[PDB]
């Protein structure tokens, strides 16, 4: 298997920008490289084949180049619909292998997370279940970390995190964190804190509730 | 008539059931009739004989130091292999990486006489053109000789297109082998340099 | 013109097999090849194998000979068959056309299909347990915890679609071979609790449709 490497997996750009995605091969692949695009709705299409040939209907802002082990795709001027994930693929030797992919992200002004903590619905507790939910909404950049705290002590077991992809309009990101506990462990403590740590704030954006 | 020049000729015999046991004898005969019209010697025309199915059976090597008579005999004693598939890609690949791994005799032309009567499965043709181009890059001329209505015509045309010297001889049956034997030996000889 | 549509099982129990038919259109299967590529959730693309115009095939050695690709030229259909499916074989499977032209060494995956999702697990159709999330400013954020369901997917709306601009539905994660996702909605404080904010969770697989109105804590 020839290993295809696409170093940046995330690439922030601004519409109009000229973007270049790199793909390198573990060995010489004699220009037998193709470029694919997977839009946010999942559609996959071939953009460039044999290093630089554009596929039918593909706009001329896309161009590919390279040889030996290094190849690249270039978008002269970034159009909105160009926001997607790009994969390079070799056909020098079977089986065909793809690169890890590079997802284009739209640049925007930093934004702080709008953190909201939720105690378990009584109906849930009615099933010996106690899930504390924490929403970290509309922030930018995408990088963020959450931390759970029960009565001051941190907890990293029983926590499930889900992140959303960049918002189509407002270009922010949102993530959810859920601390699931047994009704018993839950009713055994009082303070439940959720801490967001993001670029926009040097002091932890804390949220919490006491079991009153 | 006869060839006294610097040449390294590799006979590649289709080893598929596409050629009956009797038809393969006619093929082997043609090959021996050829060796009879070549000046077999390490200083003139060197010969190698290989039968090909899924793999290659090398009966004679260009470096084999055996009397011509011995070599013609070995040729006549090439076992019939009626395999369901004779991979041309695999033989060219074998010719490229094995036979001509190194070119010890630059003063000699190199010709791969691809005697084919079948057509391999497409999956086996994946690197076909790449192997023919690799041969071209060692200056190994590839002469395709189609035999019968199952000989891969695509590959025959494809080989002619890779290099100008790759001339094809399309025969309807092993019976035409003899009729054209002389024109074939002439062409191959003319692709070789005489020696001083 | 050129089209390729997948028809899969949707679900597959471990040890069992996957059977997907690819109905192609706009071209002849004797002229082109057809590949199978899958994408594991949250992962990249993976090439499985393909079948040439003549019927010969090529498979990814990594599939440990579990894959079989056959086709029916007359019915413009290519069949994928995979044995002993494991959980990590869960992925969206796409059938993609490719020239399969060794004459030009042209094997680009020129036209893809929408794909078909395949979840491989022993879990059984469980409906989701929907829980309303009421708060612990000028805007208020409500939520709906959709827990313990299977298989995917669910359809979470708020106020039957009336509320959307302030809605965030997060990707489902596996809590325990059962999926859990959350949905949040932010609205002006003047609208809740004074007015009703309800979340609607549909789960086709269970023919279930729950409505959970967000009520201030008791």
């Amino acid at each position: 298997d020839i290993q295809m490497t696409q170093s940046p997996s995330s690439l922030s750009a601004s519409l109009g920008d000229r973007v270049t995605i790199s793909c390198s091969a573990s060995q010489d692949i004699n220009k037998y490289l193709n470029w694919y695009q997977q839009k946010p709705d999942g559609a996959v299409k071939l953009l460039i084949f044999y290093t630089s040939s554009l596929h039918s209907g593909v706009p001329s802002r896309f161009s590919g180049s390279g040889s030996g082990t290094d190849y690249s795709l270039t978008i002269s001027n970034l159009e909105p619909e160009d926001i997607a994930t790009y994969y390079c693929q070799q056909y020098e030797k079977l089986p065909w292998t793809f690169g890890g992919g590079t997802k284009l992200e739209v640049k925007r002004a930093d934004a702080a997370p709008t953190v909201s903590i939720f105690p378990p619905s009584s109906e849930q507790l009615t099933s010996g279940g106690a899930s504390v939910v924490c929403f970290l909404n509309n922030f930018y950049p995408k990088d963020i970390n959450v931390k759970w705290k029960i009565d001051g002590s941190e907890r990293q077991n029983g926590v499930l995190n889900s992140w959303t992809d960049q918002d189509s309009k407002d270009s922010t990101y949102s993530m959810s964190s859920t601390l699931t506990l047994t009704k018993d462990e839950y009713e055994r403590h009082n303070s439940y804190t959720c801490e967001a740590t993001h670029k926009t704030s040097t002091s932890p954006i804390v949220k919490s509730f006491n079991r009153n | 008539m006869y060839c006294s020049r610097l040449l390294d000729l590799v006979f590649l015999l289709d080893g598929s059931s596409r050629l009956s046991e009797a038809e393969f004898e006619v093929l082997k005969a043609f090959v021996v009739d050829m060796m009879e019209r070549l000046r077999i010697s390490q200083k003139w025309v060197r010969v190698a004989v290989v039968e090909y199915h899924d793999g290659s059976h090398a009966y004679i090597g260009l470096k084999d130091r055996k009397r011509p008579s011995e070599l013609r005999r070995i040729a006549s004693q090439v076992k019939y292999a009626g395999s369901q598939v004779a991979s041309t890609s695999e033989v060219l690949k074998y010719t490229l990486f094995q036979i001509f791994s190194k070119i010890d005799r630059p003063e000699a032309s190199r010709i791969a006489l691809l005697l084919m009567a079948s057509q391999e499965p497409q999956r086996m043709s994946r690197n076909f053109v790449r192997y023919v181009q690799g041969l071209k890059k060692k200056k190994v001329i590839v002469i395709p000789v189609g035999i019968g209505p199952h000989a891969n015509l695509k590959q025959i045309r494809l080989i002619e297109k890779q290099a100008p010297e790759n001339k094809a001889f399309v025969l309807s049956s092993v019976d035409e082998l003899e009729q054209q034997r002389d024109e074939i030996v002439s062409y191959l000889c003319d692709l070789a340099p005489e020696a001083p | 013109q050129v089209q390729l549509a997948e028809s899969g099982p949707g679900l597959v129990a471990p040890s069992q097999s996957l059977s997907i038919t690819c109905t192609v259109s706009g071209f002849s299967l004797t002229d082109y090849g057809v590949d199978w590529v899958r994408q594991p959730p949250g992962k990249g693309l993976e090439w499985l194998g393909m079948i040439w115009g003549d019927g010969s095939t090529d498979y990814n050695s990594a599939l440990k000979s579990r894959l079989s690709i056959t086709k029916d030229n007359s019915k413009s259909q290519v069949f994928l068959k995979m044995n002993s499916l494991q959980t990590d074989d869960t992925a969206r499977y796409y059938c993609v056309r490719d020239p399969a032209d060794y004459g030009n060494y042209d094997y680009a995956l020129d036209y893809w299909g929408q794909g078909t999702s395949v979840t491989v697990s022993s879990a059984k159709t469980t409906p989701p347990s929907v829980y309303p999330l009421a708060p612990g400013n000028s805007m208020v954020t409500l939520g709906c915890l959709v827990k313990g369901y299977f298989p995917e997917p669910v359809t979470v709306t708020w106020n039957s679609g009336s509320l959307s601009s302030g809605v965030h539905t997060f990707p489902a994660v596996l809590q325990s071979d059962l999926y859990t996702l959350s949905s949040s909605v932010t609205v002006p404080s003047s609208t809740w609790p004074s007015e009703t904010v309800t979340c609607n969770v549909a789960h086709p697989a269970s023919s279930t449709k729950v409505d959970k109105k967000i009520v201030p804590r008791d």
Side-chain angles (χ1 to χ4, degrees), chain C residues 177-191:
Chain C
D177 296 353
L178 285 174
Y179 299 103
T180 305
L181 75 63
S182 255
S183 183
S184 107
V185 72
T186 301
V187 303
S189 296
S190 72
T191 69

Side-chain angles (χ1 to χ4, degrees), chain A:
Chain A
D1 281 31
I2 296 180
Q3 316 298 97
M4 308 304 293
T5 310
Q6 287 181 246
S7 282
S9 24
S10 203
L11 198 54
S12 310
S14 289
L15 304 183
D17 287 8
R18 174 201 169 93
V19 185
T20 297
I21 311 181
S22 75
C23 177
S24 81
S26 48
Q27 58 163 258
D28 184 357
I29 67 178
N30 311 284
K31 304 180 172 213
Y32 297 131
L33 184 109
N34 300 322
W35 282 97
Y36 301 89
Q37 182 202 56
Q38 168 165 60
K39 295 219 182 171
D41 74 316
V44 183
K45 40 178 268 187
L46 163 79
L47 292 180
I48 291 178
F49 62 93
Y50 196 31
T51 294
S52 63
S53 301
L54 290 206
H55 190 217
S56 302
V58 176
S60 286
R61 56 180 180 289
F62 295 88
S63 75
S65 178
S67 72
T69 56
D70 296 0
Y71 302 75
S72 59
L73 170 80
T74 283
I75 305 182
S76 69
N77 111 268
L78 185 59
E79 299 288 337
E81 76 265 36
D82 288 345
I83 299 295
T85 305
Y86 298 84
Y87 299 96
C88 61
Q89 170 255 132
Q90 64 81 19
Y91 60 97
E92 151 72 14
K93 157 150 80 166
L94 288 167
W96 299 162
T97 46
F98 296 83
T102 293
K103 195 200 302 291
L104 293 193
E105 174 218 75
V106 170
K107 271 180 188 208
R108 68 143 274 142
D110 291 16
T114 296
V115 189
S116 325
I117 191 182
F118 304 85
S121 74
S122 59
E123 12 221 312
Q124 180 196 17
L125 276 175
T126 279
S127 324
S131 289
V132 199
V133 185
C134 192
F135 290 140
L136 284 77
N137 292 342
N138 306 77
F139 56 81
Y140 189 93
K142 65 173 206 135
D143 325 281
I144 176 164
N145 99 33
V146 190
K147 178 210 265 187
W148 276 91
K149 270 197 190 187
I150 291 154
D151 284 311
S153 326
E154 169 189 12
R155 166 72 137 256
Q156 21 192 170
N157 300 66
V159 186
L160 290 187
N161 300 329
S162 193
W163 306 267
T164 56
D165 222 289
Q166 172 152 80
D167 209 321
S168 46
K169 233 60 238 179
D170 106 321
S171 311
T172 59
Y173 288 96
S174 293
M175 98 154 240
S176 191
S177 177
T178 312
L179 177 69
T180 292
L181 287 183
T182 60
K183 183 176 111 184
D184 279 333
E185 300 173 274
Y186 174 75
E187 300 182 306
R188 229 185 250 129
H189 310 97
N190 203 37
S191 319
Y192 286 100
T193 310
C194 164
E195 294 178 6
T197 286
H198 190 256
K199 181 177 183 182
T200 56
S201 184
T202 39
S203 43
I205 304 164
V206 175
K207 234 70 194 149
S208 162
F209 68 86
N210 297 293
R211 239 175 67 271
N212 59 258

Side-chain angles (χ1 to χ4, degrees), chain B residues 19-148:
Chain B
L19 274 200
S20 72
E21 166 185 355
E23 279 174 323
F24 190 71
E25 277 308 286
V26 171
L27 184 56
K28 297 163 61 182
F30 161 81
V31 169
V32 176
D33 274 358
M34 219 93 124
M35 311 180 38
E36 279 168 4
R37 293 162 169 67
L38 300 171
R39 185 151 172 193
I40 295 172
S41 171
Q42 285 289 305
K43 295 79 190 184
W44 296 95
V45 186
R46 285 151 111 217
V47 294
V49 175
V50 180
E51 167 265 301
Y52 70 91
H53 36 286
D54 297 284
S56 313
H57 271 131
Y59 293 97
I60 305 190
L62 298 159
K63 281 194 277 183
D64 282 357
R65 259 163 175 288
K66 303 194 178 178
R67 281 187 206 292
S69 32
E70 232 310 89
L71 301 182
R72 288 194 293 299
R73 176 188 84 63
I74 291 168
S76 65
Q77 300 297 109
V78 154
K79 295 164 260 195
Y80 171 72
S83 45
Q84 69 166 154
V85 170
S87 186
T88 43
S89 307
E90 268 297 319
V91 230
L92 295 174
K93 165 169 180 326
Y94 170 82
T95 297
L96 178 62
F97 296 97
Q98 296 294 321
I99 302 185
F100 301 120
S101 64
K102 240 209 318 137
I103 286 0
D104 303 31
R105 227 185 143 216
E107 66 263 25
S109 284
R110 283 144 230 90
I111 303 179
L113 195 50
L114 191 59
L115 291 157
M116 36 190 291
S118 58
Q119 168 163 200
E120 69 192 357
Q122 286 159 354
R123 78 175 276 284
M124 285 191 103
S125 302
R126 181 143 257 154
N127 283 353
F128 181 66
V129 180
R130 288 183 70 184
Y131 292 132
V132 180
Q133 261 152 21
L135 289 176
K136 183 189 180 156
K137 302 205 179 189
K138 302 207 166 146
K139 248 331 298 234
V140 175
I141 304 181
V142 174
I143 304 301
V145 185
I147 308 170

